[PDB]
């Protein structure tokens, strides 16, 4: 072809048929040099015009840019020298070939272009791009052959082309060096985030993320240490981009109504097709290159089989086994980030779009959804869309992989392959049947789980009563009975989990048995050979994942079809209509009702009926009417929240509104006051003083910076009403709407605010005030009063105008998709579903967990697992010996006995691998369940044994969250992950042993490949663990914020703060985006580094086979290379589990922390008091001291007192009375410091608590009841009969009530006695004390909050029934101790006066001075 061009042959096939095979010189110097040259001139204008599109300010000329510019200048010099050398030299006898000087011409031309673009790249933000990085990469691979050809030719002594050779070597060396400089990013401070400044070789490698990994590992990582997301990923841009497509296409869907449906998906696709297209043209590259590894394996096996194949075939088939894997590696991760980033980019387009719809949504469309049913609309109902939008491509890519794998397998084995794929297909119904069976059992368990929470909250909140009455053994067995019923069901779930795992784990070795046995037995001449044997095993490790993860792509995709419907309904709702209410400035006065009629819903009566009313913009106006008759709707009428049927409302200026129920945000109390406007010291002091928040402010700890809201300190209705009024006043608006501002405030307090805030001289003189109330306290000062009747006004006038005329009417994080780890993609999906059900409602730690597991059972389980690896090793090794039969035994000469022997042994080895892996998982379930039985029991014992001091310090909510919100982790997620870790760490070890037994020298290479693997795992775990908790801590505020704005939405529209609240969500969502995307790259940084090690393991193994080809048999390379191709996927899988195990193991450590809590004195000691010990009340003090905390101070200073039988002891005090301390004193609740108290000749310290505690009675101030029933509440052990219980109820006068109940004692008591009134609950505690019938009664303010009639009843019952028992009474008021035989006075831990109240009153004493003559 190029005879007139090259003067030599273009291509001779004989050149490649020799051991010293070299490409023809003409072919390399022309064809392979145009591919890089043609790559530029074809695409050079495009990358030039696109650069010209973004004309920005050029950065300073960096040193690196100059170096990569002068060096290319040398290439211009070298190319020019070569052209001049060829032409200026005198040789005309032989005409120069065209190739000799034409090639410099393009090199002269192309380097001129490179000089131009490299300078023009400065204007762009990214100093390097795929246009130059690929060209340098492509000009080295194509130019390598010339470098090899010239070097080999020069080594032969032919120096005819020495001048060209030396110039080419320098040109080749500089191109390699230029590539090095092209991988370095020139810092120009365009943005703090390096993603937009990273060079191309640093953006398909993620070396720009190295800074965080290095920074995170050293010191703890914090929010400000993570760079903000790219400008495109910003939530402000995404909402606007999604808004245009949503609004234009929703109207199209509205036209089809002549409720819109099937409209959300058609909008999302039209908005992100530019990202979808880039993930489709690039996914095919991964699928095409994933079948190269098996196809290249056949070539390498054939090379080892024959001793005639040339050496260069092997090396070229080993380099290609690394290049075709690097391209697959870099492209696959460049797709994972290009598609997971779409998941984050689609949730933001919905999470930040529901909020904007929430403000504008009509309440009529909000009536159906509750508060909880709206908060979950994006925490679960929109997070369902991530997983669907995370990896859609398996809807088409999985179909492609199974269809292509079948074709390749059918091309190598024959029709018998259909039987093999049939077995894997038949697994899918087994998986589906087991999955839907496990879900039924799991969800049926959630009802028993939540019941334990209800009791668990119940026990801790009220442990004081539990310690007093010593009832905790009864509840301990009550919870254990519930837990035992729980654990019996849990074990069945674990059994169903050791089968799905066993079926899925065994399916790659069962298909091999079926496929090979049928192939060899169907026909005699079908001999098995290593070329067609191991090319099938490695294909079964490729087809397995698409055909096992496909069924979840049907359930999950269908699971979004219902989740989309809820999102479809909400976004499609009709927004509120503001045509009824007008805002204008031309209007003179403030208010105007033009025959307005209003109704709550369309199918309802009009609450407002045809009223004309006008108000001047200068006075206070109040509205008075009967409660529940067209009154509460009036305030909402001038707000846009209320529906209109016929009317015309106009309002001038801003409006301020105060609701009946108070909506309060979380944060400091200052934010709820200023409302995010400003902070004026003079104004702030005015509203705070006028609104009288000072009597509260000194009471909340932290002063004005207290944590208000559910997060911190809750407030009563009265304080909440004041805050809402204070917020409105500070805003300083025009019109104020008051809706019962003084409904729940104190009467005297209500006097204070009315006069000075909104009265004759209040700060609101210049602002109109509309007020509604039913209390007749203050309406003499109101400028104008309007009386409503039948929903309309009846009389208008002031108090003296017309009213005086008559006056008669007045988890799962770090795994974005199951695609990243297809080794076990099933257990991942169940883990997310466990989390979704939830949201709808160092080495010493491992040993501690393993000690909970039967340690004897551990050594057998690990023995079964390691024996499984041996069987796997034996099976593959035996298969290698089987394929050796083809060489020795000719076709049609294969003995039938030998054929039957081969399959028979392989069948048994398919069973030794089967019967052992099942006996390990099956025994894993019986062990992991037993751990939960022991671990939970330890917590329920020590915690119930914990001192009252322990509960006082730590919050109650902390313990509960660690009782079942943490136990769920140790027995749903931890057991399944651990059994899925050792089953893969034994895959890496098994694979490495396989290679080491073929080429022993390879084990040296393991050490560099072990240090790298450990270092990468160590770095990633030390960082991604921090990045996991840092996401959860910042994800919760988004959902928490939405609950506070959907509930307080009517207030928001009153102040027109919609725009401010939207911006609050933009920053709040963005802070989550900068964290979710922050580990996605951190997850990709694992894959590239580890697949680089996985590729190096395979590449360095193929060289060992190639080099040691004289001794290695052809079939031996099969089981060494077929099982090594799976090391790439297993290697990154192993590290991910180690991250999740190391994160979920903190749950066990937290449990152990409370299990080690210091424990009180033994319940039962060697001394048991006789029944006559509580027979008489002999209480004596011996200078006893008490201490709340062993380090603060001494509460008691050695009180000494003698108490005889029938001594009505009255103990009183003002400050530090120790009345609480005395209750903890007599019952051994606290520790004994310097004294002791002797009872009936026996010291309390000697007696065991449980025997001691039961023998006295106590009535707590707070009557907390129990949720079981009344029968168990009165008596947990229930040793008493029904007649005694009925008599006790009669004694407490509950007989008439309980007998009138539904079933009496069998009545279902709700939480905290929610079905019983406060006065009712205060009578149960008397019955509880009545049942004891013991001589000692300790009282502690049981009548501080009871009515007088019941108060007289309560003491009389104590006076009458316990007239035969010693009673010690504690009362804050001295009006209940005149009936006391002995009255005790003490202050700050020291007794003041001793004596009866009769003699105490005669002598003027300190208690007489402060309580009798001054307190009376």
Author numbering: 1 to 258, 305 to 856, 884 to 914, 963 to 1537
What did the original publication write about this model?
Bilirubin is conjugated in hepatocytes and excreted to bile duct via the ATP-binding cassette transporter ABCC2, dysfunction of which would lead to Dubin-Johnson syndrome. Notably, ABCC2 also has an extra N-terminal TMD0, which exists mainly in ABCC family and was suggested to participate in the subcellular localization. Here we determine the structures of ABCC2 in the apo, substrate-bound and ATP/ADP-bound forms using the cryo-electron microscopy, exhibiting a full transporter with a regulatory (R) domain inserted between the two half modules.
The M-segment of the R domain is fixed in translocation cavity via abundant hydrogen bonds and salt bridges with the residues from TMD1 and TMD2. Specifically, Glu892 from the loop of the M-segment forms a hydrogen bond with Tyr381 from TMD1. In addition, Glu893 forms a hydrogen bond with Asn1204 and two salt bridges with Arg1205 and Arg1257 of TMD2, respectively. To investigate the function of the M-segment that binds to the translocation cavity, we generated the variants E892Q and E893Q for ATPases activity assays. We further performed the transport activity assays using radioisotope-labeled substrate E217βG and found that E892Q and E893Q also exhibited a significant increase of transport activity.
